[PDB]
Design an enzyme around this catalytic site. Structure first.
Site, PDB file in Angstrom:
ATOM      1  N   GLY A 178      34.007  39.071  40.223  1.00 21.94           N
ATOM      2  CA  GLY A 178      33.724  39.276  38.807  1.00 21.94           C
ATOM      3  C   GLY A 178      32.225  39.354  38.592  1.00 21.94           C
ATOM      4  O   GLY A 178      31.439  39.043  39.489  1.00 21.94           O
TER       5      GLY A 178
ATOM      6  N   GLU B 274      36.103  44.634  38.448  1.00 22.84           N
ATOM      7  CA  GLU B 274      36.402  44.305  37.056  1.00 22.84           C
ATOM      8  C   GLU B 274      35.404  44.983  36.111  1.00 22.84           C
ATOM      9  O   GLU B 274      34.327  44.437  35.863  1.00 22.84           O
ATOM     10  CB  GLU B 274      36.410  42.777  36.867  1.00 22.84           C
ATOM     11  CG  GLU B 274      37.417  42.048  37.760  1.00 22.84           C
ATOM     12  CD  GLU B 274      37.244  40.535  37.786  1.00 22.84           C
ATOM     13  OE1 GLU B 274      36.751  39.962  36.792  1.00 22.84           O
ATOM     14  OE2 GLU B 274      37.616  39.919  38.807  1.00 22.84           O
TER      15      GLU B 274
ATOM     16  N   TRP C  44      43.918  31.220  41.370  1.00 21.68           N
ATOM     17  CA  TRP C  44      42.459  31.197  41.416  1.00 21.68           C
ATOM     18  C   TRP C  44      41.983  29.867  40.838  1.00 21.68           C
ATOM     19  O   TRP C  44      42.180  29.633  39.647  1.00 21.68           O
ATOM     20  CB  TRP C  44      41.836  32.335  40.598  1.00 21.68           C
ATOM     21  CG  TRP C  44      40.337  32.225  40.637  1.00 21.68           C
ATOM     22  CD1 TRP C  44      39.544  31.454  39.826  1.00 21.68           C
ATOM     23  CD2 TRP C  44      39.464  32.835  41.591  1.00 21.68           C
ATOM     24  NE1 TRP C  44      38.228  31.569  40.205  1.00 21.68           N
ATOM     25  CE2 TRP C  44      38.149  32.416  41.282  1.00 21.68           C
ATOM     26  CE3 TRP C  44      39.659  33.713  42.665  1.00 21.68           C
ATOM     27  CZ2 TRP C  44      37.035  32.847  42.010  1.00 21.68           C
ATOM     28  CZ3 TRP C  44      38.548  34.139  43.392  1.00 21.68           C
ATOM     29  CH2 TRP C  44      37.255  33.699  43.060  1.00 21.68           C
TER      30      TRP C  44
END
Length: 342
Positions: free
Chosen positions: A75, A117, A323
């Site tokens: 991310g 992402e 996660w």
């Protein structure tokens, strides 16, 4: 049944791979290899080579049948920028594809994951299609020439098939994905957080259209084979500071991020509760929250995880993922999840 966990290399000092209860998983991910612009010779962050090499032999000592994948990206904006640069350049894509496959084999991983992402707007999706198509073909070619079992290929996806539900600029091409990938990791969390002025269920299964079920339904409606979907479940909560200590439910007014910078690990949440926070299960959203004084945290507990895992089974999904595994040190939630599917 896919029982998936992500281990972040950042956590090595406090949670080395030897601490993972790999008996509770079928697949474990090393997160993350870097894209390494401008050459795009994909690599683990320099200095972490030994950690990457030792990952798979270490986790396999407790459960030899467990398989591993290495996830490329992460991310955050730098990674997104790098994917966008990479995917527009045919030569760079070739270097990425060759080096990614070599990386997996080098360290003894059984597959590759792409954490991008996100591939939006439309141009970025079109260029991501080019990368993934080339990667799929090269993975199949490597399996033939080397004679070894074919590398698995997965990717992170947004909770919803549309990017984005409120304003559609592009969408995940589900047929393409189903043909090229073994599964996708549906990031069914971070729906709500300290960026909002009201407390909420950050990974609500249902409610609002920002929910895990609505997202899953969207992939299914588009034509994704259900077995290609792996439902993400967070091992962390999102935290807020409350405006008033007597308004403590969902939808209570908030004045900013709680600890730590708006996120708490499940293990820390357990400490929060043992230290006097009250735990509440919210049946409306299928979620948990806990509060003490001016601190409020929304998360998944033993009940909501079991409900989410059973949901995944009833929806005929490929499985679930967590996660991230360092955030539940006693593996409380991976245990209930594994027991639930079994």
């Amino acid at each position: 049944a896919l029982k998936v966990g992500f281990w972040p290399a950042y956590s090595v000092s406090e949670f080395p791979p030897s601490k993972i209860n790999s008996r509770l998983f079928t697949h474990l991910y090393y997160a993350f290899a870097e894209l390494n612009a401008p050459t795009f010779e994909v690599r683990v962050p320099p200095g972490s080579e030994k950690t990457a090499e030792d990952f798979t032999p270490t986790v396999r000592r407790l459960n030899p049948s467990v398989k591993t994948l290495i996830s490329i990206g992460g991310g955050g904006s730098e990674v997104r920028d790098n994917f966008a640069k990479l995917n527009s350049d045919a030569s760079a894509r070739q270097r990425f594809v060759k080096s990614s496959i070599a990386l997996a084999r080098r360290y003894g991983f059984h597959g590759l994951d792409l954490d991008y992402e996100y591939p939006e707007p439309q141009l970025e999706m079109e260029n991501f299609v080019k990368l993934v198509s080339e990667l799929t073909a090269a993975i199949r070619e490597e399996a033939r020439t080397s004679g070894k079992p074919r590398l698995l290929l997965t990717e992170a996806v947004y909770f919803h098939q549309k990017l984005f539900p409120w304003e559609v600029v592009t969408e995940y091409p589900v047929q393409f994905i189903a043909a090229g990938l073994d599964w996708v990791n549906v990031m069914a969390y971070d729906f709500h957080g300290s960026w909002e002025n009201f407390t909420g269920a950050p990974a609500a299964l249902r409610d609002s259209k920002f929910t895990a079920s609505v997202g899953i339904e969207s992939f299914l409606a588009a034509g994704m084979p259900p077995e290609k979907l792996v439902l993400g479940i967070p091992l962390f909560g999102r935290s807020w500071l409350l405006k008033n200590n007597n308004e403590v439910g969902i939808g209570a007014p908030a004045v900013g991020a709680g600890p730590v910078d708006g996120a708490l690990s499940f293990s820390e949440i357990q400490n929060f509760i043992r230290g006097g926070a009250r735990e509440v299960f919210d049946t409306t959203t299928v979620s948990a929250y806990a509060y003490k004084d001016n601190v409020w945290v929304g998360y998944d507990n033993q009940q909501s995880v079991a409900l989410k895992v059973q949901y995944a089974k009833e929806k005929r999904l490929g499985g679930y993922f967590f996660w991230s595994v360092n955030q539940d040190i006693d593996a409380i939630l991976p245990k209930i999840a594994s027991d639930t599917w079994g």
